[PDB]
């Protein structure tokens, strides 16, 4: 085999989310790359060097070391400076040195079992002939793989026009030809679901009952950076989408893998490859946190999403690999700011499709530079 | 001991829901006072003429008339055009002509036993010793009353920060002194929850099985106008508060008869009076909405709701009546605008409270001005 | 007949304005109230304790002390914490220690003649029979009486839309009983002019050349608060009224001292007290400002004052004194508030008065609660 | 010479301008096309068959004809339908028509000479060794070129920055070579200024006094599309900037104009081309309008025009033709919008820049498509 992964993770925290991850991590020798911020205090990097002395393969790069190697690649003003988008810094040099594995988890993420690293090693076994997993309606809920109370849920980013007709959805599984790039695991205790339901339901993850699925072409569902793993061609596709952008007035928020998961997706799926749900799953703990402000963060996004949903459906792309692929949808998403209709698609969020493609291609124009 | 009762109605359909609607009002002798609005198709004002020709006590008065009632209580600018805020028309006449009961609803409610006129006078019995309900955190969920699937919710207005642990609250019921002044039934089907719960498990309520109560001195609910019978007397303090103000830029909506229920209740426990909930149950059929356009609408007014609701506790009134006592709450509202701390509480925010006062003490100086 | 003068400032600077600016305060023994803010740095404060070392009855309250203060009057959100809306906290100290004259200027002004506190002590003169000035359109232009290069310009916050006929206005002087409680005196070099004039021909006043003049009943022009004498029973309804308001979506700024200045107008002429335009003249340098930052902040209210300003000379007022006159104008303002219309009155432009009107009774409530 | 001439209009009037303007136009054989839009009248469509009765080559395409145009050319969506963007339109069907003069109008502009159209034919005399003007501030002022009254005025336009120091700028003419291709004619009685400078001091402009010049490389002036005359080569580069896009949640209005005289300029001078300003000019009647609305929809363009304008000057081009440039301009402004620092620059105004680069590019896609 000989495979190399590496965990990206960015944090503002003192460093202590390493004493019950680092071991998961080291155990199997791969590569932590944690991803400070201007307000990241000391105690982080004291944290890092005391367990790279315990035999972690871990770096910390200061954001003087950031800035220097966006310099070099033309692109100084690509990642903001006070935001969680600073991941990028982790995918870039994760890519730059090589790996085979990226696996994008959150600094309050915790492997659950012991064989964390392999599981997500899925994404390196090429193309074989796999049970796929159809669906009619084209959605596929991966919450209904885990046991959740106290009633049902979909995760965050799945569109809203969909759930009320997914109950009545046909789900066939096939034996067919995939190449898994994308492996998004699961989560325990506080799942992926967005802000509105959360604040309705107050999900929990009890158990992972449902095991792994691999979904087929037009079968889709959103795919989230905290718990997932890319294979090193498949990364181009996997820009953390900027944030900030104002919606008649309102700046989104916390939506930056909601449309990374669904770029990478639709690129995936033009190249023949497949995106796998299920296992290695993490422990995520319950929030702390205001969540009628995660609410009003989430909710200029949230009224974009099934719109751009549907166009991402009709508007064919081209390119031989993920770059060629991702730029290609960098323009599809420009033609499809000025056909979409609605009342949420004031100047502003057409604008925001517009910026956002420009952005795209700064970040695979800096990984053209690296190559 | 003959009660007189008034059922107030604002919309801008045809006026086919009088065909089903008609037969439980003048079963009874009930006044319906149907308000139209600028938009409002002369098909309406045909069906309310030819169902007084069946025996039903109806008034549609045209918007030349209404505002010919408004200019001479020197209220001119009170209330909006294009608004169901008309429904204060509604109110203001059934007000002036002296009805005992008056009985919010909308023009999509259905009763749905033929007692409705009289489980609603429920609102004149006058005080009596009782079994009223009290809670250890001074909310009660009405839903808990009906049988609602998927899963349980809590009606629209229900403060956010008080949902997690209100499972662990206790429930007792106690004989005592109560007058109960404001009955607001509840409705099978589509349950009022606000936009938050509706998108995320879809509610639907199957059936009331839980009865009736009647809130203690220091428990709460909210209270809406699409099926509740307010005692003349509280009527004053019934006032449906004008939306539009923005709150950080978003401006609210959706919310008028959230602000006007707990007001009306808080005035009602000031004066010694009680809030009732449970039957009559109206048919509130589901209307497929654009949900994202009523989350979109309804999180201004819920970012705020939850700091208005702790001060209204803190804040002492004064009065007599309910004139007087509802004046006193609109100063109180000012007192809080100043007093109230959050991310949501931008200077537009604030001084939604203060625009909101001053409309208050226009209502009740129209009210002083008929009277 | 010793006359008793109080020099109010706000700054944030480290205080090198006193060396120009106490010789002609303590050549007439008047206090100076200098009102820090949070960000003041700590050199202001040697700056003052050192000039009284020469003889400056200065004063520096730190915002530990403004706090207390304003606590003990029950208005401790009245005043913000980074505004120069602070000096409010400098009338109000004078106002309480018992000054006859209070002398409002900004930290950039500095007294040309030596007899700087003796002109501003003609608003004790008392009333007299002595020649007013009034004009047929009922405003007059104090930059009329100085010389401006290259262009002739109007005052800060003058009305737009009576600009373009009041070259037409005729202009006349009669010996009529006047008493004066309001002195503006003029400023060389850099004019008060809005930011829209400054952009256009940025101005330079080169001298004083057409005298004081009185204006008479109906006769108006804009007072600002950087060189401006009010007497202690004028002060009251002089208060610096709060920005930050979005009009529609815009936050307002710059124009706190524009309504005060108008407002105690307003209020001097209800009780037969007139305002004088004229000496002492100040030297205002040029400051190289962000003029394009200036105009995005003064267009929100400039927007709104001509509307303002026309509907306050069709409303009456009611009052003995400057308290009672001043809660009498906070209530007309609320019903200008529902009366005005335009397209710069949004929901957020009108809740602007409501929460105006609710600050300056919060502001008479604590000189009520003083006397 | 056998030159073809079109004026270009777009209007919503009833069609009255055109008997004081088309005798000028139809003189010298030239076509006339106006552009009509959703809220135009049958009026101007029966006063523009009347007078081609007397023999003017004018053209009315309904908004039914000119969807197909655009939809054929794969743009239906490019150009809004309740603005004087249409006048691209015009634009468009005078370069598909093959014209070799084209001259955007106004439907209030009046011309004052018989050769109006004859002056405008400058632009295809070719390159010839002429007295052209240069700057040491690399500006130019051509209302300087005008008798204007109270005072002297800057264009429409005109950077803010650099209007304090112009006074001192050193002003040159030297014999070179230069090739005319966009003539900019000056205008009588209210000039092309500001809503800032109108505001201010209502400029009057008497007569044209200062002849015209030609300006040389490095030395831009604001140019607008009420009275210019545009050679076909350099119409792909004259696209009239949409407006609409929020700065700061402000949305920018009337200023398509000086993007685009800015833009076809410096492709002009990449190419090297140059711009005239002068004869013929104009009648242009005052104003009847709200200059504080007009105040409020320019100052958003305003805060980000200086700090495009710097921007524009440090970044080189590239192309063969005007297509070519236009498009690599386009591309430029992608970069200035993530370079450029301000208060005046957030996400939504540098969106603005990026939505604006792909309409640009969707003009000249379908401008490729006609050839
Ligand atoms: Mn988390
Ligand atoms: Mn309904
Ligand atoms: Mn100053
Ligand atoms: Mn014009």
Redesign the interface.
């Known amino acids: 085999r000989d495979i190399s992964t590496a965990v990206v993770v960015t944090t503002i925290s003192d460093g202590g989310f390493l004493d019950r991850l680092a071991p998961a991590l080291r155990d199997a020798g791969a590569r932590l790359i944690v991803i400070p911020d201007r307000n990241t205090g000391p105690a982080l990097f004291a944290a890092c060097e005391r367990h790279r002395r315990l035999g972690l393969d871990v770096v910390c790069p200061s954001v003087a070391e950031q800035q220097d190697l966006l310099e070099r690649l033309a692109v100084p ?2 990642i903001p400076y006070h935001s969680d988008n600073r991941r990028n810094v982790g995918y870039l040099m994760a890519w730059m040195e090589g790996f085979d594995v990226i696996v994008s988890m959150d600094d309050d993420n915790l492997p659950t079992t012991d064989d964390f690293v392999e599981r997500h090693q899925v994404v390196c076994q090429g193309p074989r002939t796999q049970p796929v997993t159809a669906s009619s309606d084209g959605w596929f809920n991966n919450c209904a793989l885990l046991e959740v109370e ?4 979909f995760p965050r980013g799945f569109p ?1 026009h969909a ?2 007709a997914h109950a009545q959805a046909r789900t066939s599984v096939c034996e067919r030809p995939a190449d898994v790039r994308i492996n998004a695991g699961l989560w325990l205790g506080d799942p992926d679901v967005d802000a ?2 959360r ?4 999900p929990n993850a009890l158990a992972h009952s449902g095991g792994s699925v691999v979904l087929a072409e037009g079968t889709w569902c959103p795919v989230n950076s905290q718990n997932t793993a890319v294979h090193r061609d498949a990364l181009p596709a996997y820009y953390f989408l900027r944030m ?3 919606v ?4 989104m928020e916390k939506f930056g893998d909601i449309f990374s998961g669904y770029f990478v997706q639709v690129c995936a799926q033009h190249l023949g490859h497949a995106v796998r749900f299920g296992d290695p799953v993490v422990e995520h703990p319950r929030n702390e946190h ?4 995660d ?2 963060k989430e ?1 200029p996004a ?2 974009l999403l ?1 719109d751009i949903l549907d166009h991402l459906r009709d508007h064919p792309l081209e390119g031989g690999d993920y770059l060629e692929t991702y730029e290609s949808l960098s323009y599809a998403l ?1 033609e499809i ?3 979409v209709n609605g ?2 698609w ?3 969020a ?3 499709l ?2 956002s ?2 952005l795209m291609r ?1 970040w695979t124009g800096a990984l053209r530079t690296v190559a």
């Open positions: 003003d690509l106290p009633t049902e849920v809203f759930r009320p509105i339901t604040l309705a339901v107050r900030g952008q104002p008649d007035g309102v700046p205001d969540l009628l402000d609410l009003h909710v949230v009224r099934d420009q700011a000025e056909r009342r949420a004031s100047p502003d057409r604008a925001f517009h910026r493609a420009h700064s």
